Design a protein around this ligand. Structure first.
Ligand SMILES: [Zn+2]
Ligand SMILES: [Zn+2]
Lengths: 153, 153
């Protein structure tokens, strides 16, 4: 198996730890952990292209998109590789994350190791917002916290 | 050409940005940048195994050592893959870093992408201190700042 981890930090109070694990190459990736300090409700949750934190979350670049598609939800055929949809923060501002995704990988030429996981200010509209911003970012707004995706024990 | 970047942060005042670039998969890696907030003199400078910041720099684990060798300087035949030796901080606490290393790689089975770069409290004795600690860590002492090695534009 490949096991990786991401520590999410930003300019504000949002912080979290997200685990990724893949049992076999181009097999499904389990993504799980916890994020705290989020406003109650849905938050966009994406892998961005660059593991570059030189200008905070801004230098991570756009959603990881090596197949040059439009933004969508994780269940859509038309999506970015990095499109993991939303996570849900409870009334205490805690998002318990548990996702299974078959498009991201921890191996091969489109591997997300050394890229950036970002949790966003607002809900990802999954490309259903009726504008160019919807088909690029899902209107998920600002980057609250991010981390570079790193190899774990 | 693979280009990667590492933002070094820690508990205290030490911070920096280190770039890595490799033209070909066989080839040397250029390592360069700047670290500030250091004591004047030599500081151990190592790639550690895990890109895991869950318990700060401690969760990075030991020096990256896929060939199960003893600690050395970068020029020693016996070294860890992660053994990049010392960087030098000037009297203002700034280390200008410029290293070329042919043992680390930014691709292949022993890639350092998603691993951790650490700058240490004291000088690396390059595995020549005549104790067990020398053969593991070079007696470079505590981890002042670290970052996950990420993909850059
Ligand atoms: Zn997207
Ligand atoms: Zn070593």
């Amino acid at each position: 198996a490949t096991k990786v981890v991401c520590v999410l930090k930003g300019d504000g109070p949002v912080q979290g730890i997200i685990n990724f694990e893949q049992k076999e190459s181009n097999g499904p990736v389990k993504v799980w952990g916890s994020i705290k300090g989020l406003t109650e409700g849905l938050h966009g949750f994406h892998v961005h292209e660059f593991g570059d934190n030189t200008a905070g979350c801004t230098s991570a670049g756009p959603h990881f998109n090596p197949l040059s598609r439009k933004h969508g939800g994780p269940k859509d055929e038309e999506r970015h590789v990095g499109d993991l949809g939303n996570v849900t923060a409870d009334k205490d501002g805690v998002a318990d994350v548990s996702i299974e995704d078959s498009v991201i990988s921890l191996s091969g030429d489109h591997c997300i190791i050394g890229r950036t996981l970002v949790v966003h200010e607002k809900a990802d509209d999954l490309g259903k917002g009726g504008n160019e911003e919807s088909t690029k970012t899902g209107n998920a707004g600002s980057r609250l916290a991010c981390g570079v995706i790193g190899i774990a024990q």
